[PDB]
Amino acid sequence: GHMGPNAVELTTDQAWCLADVLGAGSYPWVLAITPPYSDHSQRSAFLAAQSAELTRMGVVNSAGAVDPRVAQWITTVCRATQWLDLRFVLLRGMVARRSEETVVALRNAQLVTFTAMDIGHQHALVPVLTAGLSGRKPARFDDFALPAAAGARADEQIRNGAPLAEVLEFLGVPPSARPLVESVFDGRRTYVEIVAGEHRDGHRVTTEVGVSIIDTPHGRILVHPTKAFDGEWISTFTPGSADAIAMAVERLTASLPSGSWF
Secondary structure, three states, rough: OOOOOOOEEEEEEEHHHHHHHHHEEEEEEEEOOOEEEOOOHHHHHHHHHHHHHHHHHOOOOOOOOOOOHHHHHHHHHOOOOOOOOOEOEEEEEEEEEEOEEEEEEEEOOOOEEEEEOOOOOOHHHHHHHOOOOOOEEOOOOOOOOEHHHHHHHHHHHHHHHOHHHHHHHHHHHHHHHHHHHHHOOOOEEEEEEEEEEEOOOOEEEEEEOEEEEEEOEEEEEEEEEEEEEOEEEEEEEEEOOHHHHHHHHHHHHOOOOOOOOO
């Protein structure tokens, strides 16, 4: 239910219900909210089964009206004009901007939280971007780069059963960097993939590549993309300090038509 004036926690079933009655539209795919009902018979019934609990929490009144703030937040998420998609590796997030309003939607299994936020600068975002991680401090190592497609290719090769020593040796990972790089190509990792988007005259435009933040036993690691003139993308691995993260996400949004958030 309500968690202070600026955040509410709902079941995803409830969140779906609200978007529906508000005519808010659809939740973005990134939140992966499963529909509670397929048709109008099931819709009316599901509304009725949910009505009491929504009233008890003070989110919908006994007459069917939704809390003014919750309605605005849902609307900002479903109709965002600019956003960041957050895929944590079911833990899914989105930072939605509409008009001057910023709302963070955070879906965790059967629950989703909506939090209205003042994000006036880059650094305010970093706690949100790292919420689903492991509280690791920045790793300590010198930056390295490789083609983005090669990193993804290498990752998929283990998903196809290939040996790590073999794969990393031919990527050219030096022995000094093996413990760090092996820890990245390790499922005990926690990470988030960040894609930026905007809605411009009916047209969805998103970044072709994303920013990743990864927590391993070696610390927090930032992976950010740079476009080369041959058209292929370069991934750079670097310590995931708040400063580095904030600058990488800024440059990511700046690559879209409406430009940086900051």
